[PDB]
RNA sequence: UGAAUACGUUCCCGGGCCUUGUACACACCGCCCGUCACGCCAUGGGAGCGGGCUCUACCCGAAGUCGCCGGGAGCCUACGGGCA
C-alpha cells in the first residue's frame, strides 16, 4: 500500500512508434513467446493494409478506442479492459490464422462493430 | 522469450502487531447455568391413629383439719364436758 507503486513504461515496436502496441502484443502473448505474438500482430496489420489500404496503426488505436468502456473507468483500466475483449473476441473468430482473426477483429472494432465492441455495449448498458 | 495487474488494494477473508473496554476464567474450538436418569441423607405440613400432660365447666371421693349440733336410754366418770 501507499507510494502508488509503479507500472513501468515500455517503448514502441518498430513501424508504429506506440506503446499500446507492445502492450497488446502482451495480450496475444502466450507461453511466454512474444517473438511469435509479435509477428502475429505485424502480419495481422499487413493484412489490414492489404485489405483496406489504410494505416494499420490508425486502425489499431481507433479500434482500442472504440472498446474502452466509459462505465461498468480509470484512463488506464480503459486500456486493460479494451485489450481483453479484443483478444477474447479475436480468439473466437472463424479465420484459421491468428493474424487474420485479430486483423478482422481490429477493423470491425475500428468501425464500431464486432463481438468485442458488442460486449462493451452490454457492460455499459448494464451499468447505466 | 518475457508479461498482464499492483492503489480506487483505505474495506476486508486471514495472519501479526500497538492500543481501549468488559465478563468469566486461564484446557480459553473456554467457562457457567438448568433439566433429566441413578444413589444416600435430611426438612416441614397434612387426613388419621396411639400414649402422656395442660386449661375451662358440671358431676359431693377418701384421709385430715375446721365449725355446729350432739345421742336422751345412748359409749361413760357428773362442777358436763366429752369420746365414738
Curated annotation (Swiss-Prot):
Belongs to the universal ribosomal protein uS7 family. InterPro entries: Ribosomal_uS7, Ribosomal_uS7_bac/org-type, Ribosomal_uS7_CS, Ribosomal_uS7_dom, Ribosomal_uS7_dom_sf. Keywords: Ribonucleoprotein, Ribosomal protein, RNA-binding, rRNA-binding, tRNA-binding. This is Small ribosomal subunit protein uS7. The gene is rpsG. GO terms for biological process: translation. The keyword RNA-binding applies. SUPFAM superfamilies: Ribosomal protein S7 (SSF47973). GO terms for molecular function: rRNA binding; structural constituent of ribosome; tRNA binding. It comes from the Bacteria. Part of the 30S ribosomal subunit. Contacts proteins S9 and S11. Binds to the C-terminus of IF3 and to the C-terminus of Era. It holds the Pfam family Ribosomal_S7. GO terms for cellular component: small ribosomal subunit. It comes from Thermus thermophilus (strain ATCC 27634 / DSM 579 / HB8). Disulfide bonds: none annotated. One of the primary rRNA binding proteins, it binds directly to 3'-end of the 16S rRNA where it nucleates assembly of the head domain of the 30S subunit. Is located at the subunit interface close to the decoding center. Binds mRNA and the E site tRNA blocking its exit path in the ribosome. This blockage implies that this section of the ribosome must be able to move to release the deacetylated tRNA. The keyword rRNA-binding applies.
Amino acid at each position: 500500500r501507499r507510494r502508488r507503486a509503479e507500472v513501468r513504461q515500455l517503448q514502441p515496436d518498430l513501424v508504429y512508434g506506440d506503446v499500446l502496441v507492445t502492450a497488446f502484443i502482451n495480450k496475444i502473448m502466450r507461453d511466454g513467446k512474444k517473438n511469435l505474438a509479435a509477428r502475429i500482430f505485424y502480419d495481422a496489420c499487413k493484412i489490414i493494409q492489404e485489405k483496406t489500404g489504410q494505416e494499420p496503426l490508425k486502425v489499431f488505436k481507433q479500434a482500442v478506442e472504440n472498446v474502452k468502456p466509459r462505465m461498468e473507468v480509470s484512463p488506464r483500466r480503459q486500456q486493460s479492459l479494451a485489450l481483453r475483449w479484443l483478444v477474447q473476441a479475436a480468439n473466437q473468430r472463424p479465420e484459421r490464422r491468428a493474424a487474420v482473426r485479430i486483423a478482422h477483429e481490429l477493423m470491425d472494432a475500428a468501425e464500431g462493430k464486432g463481438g468485442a465492441v458488442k460486449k462493451k455495449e452490454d457492460v455499459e448498458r448494464m451499468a447505466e
